[PDB]
Structure 1
Amino acid sequence: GSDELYRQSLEIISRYLREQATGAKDTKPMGRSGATSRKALETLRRVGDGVQRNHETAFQGMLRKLDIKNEDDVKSLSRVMIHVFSDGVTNWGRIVTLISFGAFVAKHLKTINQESCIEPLAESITDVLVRTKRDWLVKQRGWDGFVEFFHVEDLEG
C-alpha cells in the first residue's frame, strides 16, 4: 500500500525542478504510468517556461525578499503554498504557477550551492498538492487532466 499518485506527482515535479535548475534532461526511465508522466512533464516544459518568463520580475521580487538560504527556508515556503489555495479555489493555472515558482527557486538554490535543497523543495510542493488537493486532482483524472487542460489542438475545425 504505497501512494501511487504522490509517487507519480513527485517524479514529474522533481524532474522539472531539477532540469530547470541545471539544464540537464534526466535519462532515467519514467516507470509506472510513465506515459502520462512523460506527457505531463513535456506539458510542464512548454507552459512552465512561459510562466517564468512572463512573470520574471514578480518571481525575482519574491525570491529576493524571501531570502532562501537553506533547507529550513524551503520548509518555510510550504506556508506560502498553503495560502495560495486557502480561498477554496483549485485550478491548473495555480498549480502550474506554484510549480513554476518552485523551478525559479530551484535555479536560485543551484547558484548558491544548495542543490541538496531542490529535492526537499519538490517534495514539499508535491506534499501540499497531492495530500491536500487529492480529491480535486482525482476529479480531473490526475495528470491526464493536466495534459488535456493545456492541450492546444491543430484541427481545421
Structure 2
Amino acid sequence: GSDELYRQSLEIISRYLREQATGAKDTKPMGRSGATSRKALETLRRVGDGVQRNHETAFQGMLRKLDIKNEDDVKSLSRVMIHVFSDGVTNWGRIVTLISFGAFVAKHLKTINQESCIEPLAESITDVLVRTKRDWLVKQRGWDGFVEFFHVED
C-alpha cells in the first residue's frame, strides 16, 4: 500500500491510546509489519507508562488548562504537539513524550464518552510525527529502530 510508514505508525499509536483509555489490550489482528508493531506496543506499555507515572502532575496540569471536550478541540491540539521538537532535537524520547501526552488525553476522552475522538487524536499525533519527521524516522529504521532503542538488558 501507499505510505506504509504512516499506516503502521497510526496502527501502533491508535491501539496504544485506546488500550490506555479502556485498559484492555486489543486482539484484532494487525497488518503489514504487525509483528514489529506488536513489539513496539509492548515497548510502549513499559516505557510509556513509566513516563506517565514519573510526570503525571505535569501531564495533568496540561489537561486542566486544555479543557478539551469534542473533536474540534482534539484536532486543535496539533499546535501544542509540535513543541516536543521546538528546540531542534529529534529522538525517540520526544516521540514517546508526544505519544504519552496522547495517552493522557485519550484517558480523559474515555471518561466523558468520547472514545470516538481517540481515533482522530491518534491521527493528529501520527500527522505531527510522520508528516514533519519522516526523514528522521526512515534514517532511524522506523519502528524496528524504536524497538531496538529501548532494548533492556533483561
Shift of residue 26, structure 1, vs aligned partner: 1.1
Which structure: larger Rg? 1
* SS of residue in 2 equivalent to 1:90: coil
User: Contact 2:84 / 2:97 at 8 angstroms: preserved in 1?
Assistant: no
- The answer to whether the 8 A contact 2:81-2:98 is kept is yes
Give the conservation status (yes or no) of the 8 Å contact 2:78–2:124. Answer: yes
Q: Deviations over 1:15-73 (max 9, x none)?
A: 00000000111111112101111111110110001111110111111100100111111
For structure 1, the 5+ residue unaligned runs are none
TM (norm. structure 2) is 0.97
Q: Which runs of 5+ in 2 are unaligned?
A: none
Instruction: Supply the distance in 2 between the matched residues of 1:126 and 1:108 (Cα, whole angstroms).
Output: 19
Structure 2 Cα separation of the partners of residues 89 and 125 of structure 1: 18
Could you list the per-position Cα deviations for residues 122-154 of structure 1 after superposition, in whole angstroms to 9, with x for gaps in the alignment? 000001101110000011100011001111123
CA RMSD, Structure 1 to Structure 2 (Å): 0.9
- Does the 8 Å contact 2:21/2:106 carry over to 1? yes
1:132 aligns with 2:132: yes
Partner of 2:29, secondary structure, is coil
Q: Structure 1: how far apart are the matches of 2:134 and 2:117?
A: 25
TM-score (norm 1): 0.95
Runs of 4+ with >4 A deviation: none
Moved more, 76-85 or 45-54: 76-85
Equivalents in 1 of 2:97, 2:86: separation in Å? 15
| CA displacement, residues 96-120 of structure 1 (integer Å, 9 cap, x when unaligned) | 0110110111000000111111000
- Aligned residues, how many? 154
Corresponding position of 2:25:
25
Match of 2:106 in 1: 106
